[PDB]
Nucleic acid binder design. Structure first.
Length: 437
RNA sequence: GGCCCGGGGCGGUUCGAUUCCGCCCUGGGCCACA
């Protein structure tokens, strides 16, 4: 029931069992033999190469080394031919540069081409940096592979493990650097409780200082922040999580939380209880990768939230959910309906010129003086948040993300009420409103 | 694709805009993917 106790039991959820290990070992062996039969210059990297991969995420990473002089095009072509002949099944994948994904004796494999170099300088792409990251780590993490797994298991269980945009959490690399710095999971967790948004962890110098942003300097390049994509809020969630764990250690921190569904009926009652306006913007999900899509959902979500605040609808929070089918931007506002009239500030009574221009506008109500300046009663084009957004989304589709915006232009509808509780967003809404139980 | 800094033209709104909402060109930095 104490820290050490829970951690022993926790290993059982993060460390791969022998069957997963053997399975990987057997594929690595066969993979070596196949690569050697073509006399290919390669180097295994990543969590598999260093036995730090989390249970259930066995994936082998093989980077193909290429002379500095080779053209970026030769790399991909020869890179493609090589993965082709060595994999049981292949599938060209992409990123900064293309590569090949596939299978071998049951396990996932990534065949990636990079430049064989020396000295981080002369680098050309993130992929070239990966081997250096690998070298720096193989000597220093040996022996603490399970501390890495506990850290990864902890983060994953709490939805902040990957560094991709859908997550904005802590990359695997980041986790290993943290273990090398603190020595173990518990030490990392114990100290993270004192982390601030100004913390700078410099691995190479074995130092922690106060900078301008959360910054974990890459031992391989002092200018690179390894936690660059860790969001401010995800950082906050981690620090808070560490405080709670240290105060009441539980194995629950390493178990994925149950989706805990809710009957749409109860959701309705809660929204009625809140007296708020709850609605969603629904449109078709553009066929793009999560890495281009989520940042677009975040922007679109924010531009609308911003429209809602300047338009005085008192938005509480925004959210969004993507599906195979559509995307949903979710909102909740304190104001279901606002009056048509509102007041417009005018010039000070002294400014005869501007006062005169200000009184030339034909208005339905007649302006007045108050505290030394003129004011005008004006009429709104819309009186509900839904109306406002239908208006905003129809004309400002372009500012809502390149793709999301293009899809919104060709189609979008606003759903509210019972018709909304039937969409696949009941979970995002419960989180947005802090529904508990 | 998104985010940060900077430039050159515009449209709309406002008594008044560099300064609100947005649109075209456009230079630099960065991030995710591998």
């Amino acid at each position: 029931m104490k820290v050490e106790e829970i951690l022993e039991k926790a290993l059982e959820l993060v460390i791969p069992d022998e069957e997963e290990v053997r399975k990987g070992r057997e594929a690595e062996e066969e993979l070596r033999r196949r690569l050697d039969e073509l006399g290919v210059e390669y180097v295994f990297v990543g969590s598999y190469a260093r036995n730090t991969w989390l249970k259930g995420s066995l994936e082998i990473d093989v980077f193909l080394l290429f002379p500095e002089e080779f053209s970026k095009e030769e790399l991909r072509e020869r890179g493609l031919e090589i993965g082709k002949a060595v994999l049981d099944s292949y599938e060209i994948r992409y990123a900064e540069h293309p590569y090949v994904h596939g299978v071998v004796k049951g396990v996932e494999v990534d065949v990636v081409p990079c430049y064989k170099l020396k000295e981080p300088k002369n680098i050309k792409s993130a992929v070239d940096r990966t081997p250096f990251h690998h070298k720096w780590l193989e000597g220093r993490i040996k022996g603490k592979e399970n501390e890495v797994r506990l850290l990864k298991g902890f983060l994953k269980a709490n939805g902040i493990y990957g560094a991709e945009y859908k997550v904005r959490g802590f990359s695997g690399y980041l986790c290993e650097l943290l273990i090398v710095f603190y020595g173990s999971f518990l030490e990392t967790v114990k100290n993270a409780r004192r982390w601030t948004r100004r913390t700078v962890i410099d691995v190479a110098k074995g130092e922690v200082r106060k900078g301008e942003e959360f910054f974990v300097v890459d031992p391989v390049d002092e200018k690179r922040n390894v936690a660059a994509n860790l969001s401010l809020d995800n950082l906050a969630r981690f620090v808070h999580l560490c405080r709670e764990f240290m105060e009441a250690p539980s194995l629950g921190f390493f178990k994925p939380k149950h989706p805990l569904e809710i009957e749409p009926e109860r959701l309705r009652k809660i929204v009625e209880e809140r007296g708020t306006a709850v609605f969603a913007v629904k449109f078709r999900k553009p066929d793009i990768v999560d890495d281009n899509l989520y940042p677009q959902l975040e922007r679109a979500s924010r531009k609308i939230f911003e429209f809602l605040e300047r338009e005085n609808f008192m938005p509480l929070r925004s959210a969004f959910k993507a599906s195979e089918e559509f995307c949903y931007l979710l909102f909740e506002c304190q104001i279901k309906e606002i009056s048509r009239v509102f007041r417009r500030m005018g010039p000070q009574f002294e400014d005869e010129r501007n006062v005169k221009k200000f009184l030339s506008r034909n208005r339905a109500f007649r302006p007045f003086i108050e505290n030394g300046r003129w004011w005008a009663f004006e009429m709104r084009k819309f009186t509900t948040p839904e109306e406002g957004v239908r208006s905003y989304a129809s004309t400002h589709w372009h500012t809502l993300g390149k793709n999301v915006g293009e899809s919104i232009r060709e189609y979008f509808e606003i759903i509210s009420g019972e018709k909304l509780f039937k969409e696949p967003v009941t979970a995002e809404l419960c989180e947005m409103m802090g529904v508990k139980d």
